[PDB]
Design a protein around this nucleic acid. Sequence first.
DNA 1: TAGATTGTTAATCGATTAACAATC
DNA 2: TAGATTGTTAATCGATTAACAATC
Lengths: 217, 217
Amino acid sequence: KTIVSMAVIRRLPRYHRYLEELLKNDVKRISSRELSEKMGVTASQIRQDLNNFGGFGQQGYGYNVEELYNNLTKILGLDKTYNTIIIGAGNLGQAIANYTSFEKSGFNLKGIFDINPRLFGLKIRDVEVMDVETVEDFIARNKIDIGILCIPKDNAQYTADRLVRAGIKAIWNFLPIDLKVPDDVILENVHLSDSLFTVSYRLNEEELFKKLKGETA
Amino acid sequence: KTIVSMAVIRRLPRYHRYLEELLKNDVKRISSRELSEKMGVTASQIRQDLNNFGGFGQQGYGYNVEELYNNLTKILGLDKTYNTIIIGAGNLGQAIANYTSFEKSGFNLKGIFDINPRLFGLKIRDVEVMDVETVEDFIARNKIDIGILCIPKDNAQYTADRLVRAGIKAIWNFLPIDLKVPDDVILENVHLSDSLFTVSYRLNEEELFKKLKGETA
DNA sequence: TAGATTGTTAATCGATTAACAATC
DNA sequence: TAGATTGTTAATCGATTAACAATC
Ligand SMILES: NC(=O)c1ccc[n+]([C@@H]2O[C@H](COP(=O)([O-])OP(=O)([O-])OC[C@H]3O[C@@H](n4cnc5c(N)[nH+]cnc54)[C@H](O)[C@@H]3O)[C@@H](O)[C@H]2O)c1
Ligand SMILES: NC(=O)c1ccc[n+]([C@@H]2O[C@H](COP(=O)([O-])OP(=O)([O-])OC[C@H]3O[C@@H](n4cnc5c(N)[nH+]cnc54)[C@H](O)[C@@H]3O)[C@@H](O)[C@H]2O)c1
């Protein structure tokens, strides 16, 4: 359980995103008026959400883009730095390993790990792939903050444990399993496996209620 | 805006997943009682959610795993078939293209597209990479249901449009951009670029309110 | 200044939980 | 059958919206 309501927290990187578009375009200031306009949210929510972390607004003025942006940056914690590792140098593994946008925002890939020894030594974007046996130790030596999980779901909770045990601070989970972690570990589930299904679901939904509303009268 | 509340819809793939674990272990039946136990949700919510699509339950008995599972299948619309294409044969592109579990559940890769001709013809898991010029057409000839977007964000709304125009039914969106689609197009955003930030945010949150609760008294 | 727009509290809306009568 | 567990309605909780007095 976190201090701010999660519904809100999930909307923060979104503000961060739009605010930076405005900053990038030399727009000097914006009002929640115009922002909710632009983001298709309610002007209340915006003022509402923001006023969990204080007033960045100025009556009569609106919000100074540069100053609010720079503040969301600090709120999302992106003024700091995060050492990350990837477990599972697979397809997804490597695609995530190659992607560098994350770096810009503070997240530095320190290591990649796999069981399959063919891969040991292999270098992706200049981080070498290492035996996942040594992970528990490497985490401890290198103050690893986030572990990115891209190994097959099978018996993976075991590996998740070894991570937690070794003092990993949060896990980013790409497997289609709900993992079990301690209270002091942030688990972020992705679950494409699911997200996709809400699409197949939405596509069929409208016809699925002729299938069920043709069941009473 | 959809018939069932979204909050619910997003939990459906989750039930589906659990139910299938049970089915896999020959467990003949389960009660919302034991399920909310196993899933760490409230027994009401389960019964609650499910009774949007009818009573698969039996008083005194609970839920027949097999029959409930098979019904979630039908609800999530995983009893039909979906033609999918991928735009952008990059890292993520190919990673998603190579992943075959999606097929098992109804989703069939019919094509992959790129602008860079250096890829044209190249075959991934036996679909060959084609010029994204031809996509508008290929969508129409092959009744493509979902387009998976894995192109760089820059100017992508243009490409998005082309897809919509050609009558794609939904887009699965992996770019860190909010796209604009018509009412009759299902847009599913992924936004790893965000989800990750809720982790850096959570890591710094507890200290961020010492930084702000040391600001009044 | 005075018109504009925020911080913030109050009213509404939706989603979760709890309760219980119906029933297998 | 009778103990168990659902379908469903009612009570609670949380999140979104609306409103307005404070203030730049
Ligand atoms: N790839 C996708 O498009 C996609 C979509 C949804 C979910 N996933 C999940 O992503 C994870 C991997 O998918 P992928 O990268 O396409 O599969 P992959 O390419 O087979 O990756 C598996 C990698 O993990 C390695 N490995 C296996 N076990 C371990 C272990 N215990 N410790 C360290 N390394 C290990 C294995 O050698 C291989 O390199 C799986 O859990 C999928 O279920 C992937
Ligand atoms: N890879 C990740 O780890 C990751 C994480 C978060 C977001 N993303 C997003 O995923 C998308 C692609 O990432 P990636 O695949 O790693 O980059 P990539 O590996 O450079 O893939 C880009 C591919 O798309 C092709 N392309 C460019 N423009 C077009 C176009 N207009 N139509 C069709 N194809 C085009 C391009 O030639 C290349 O093959 C980008 O939108 C990223 O922002 C990726």
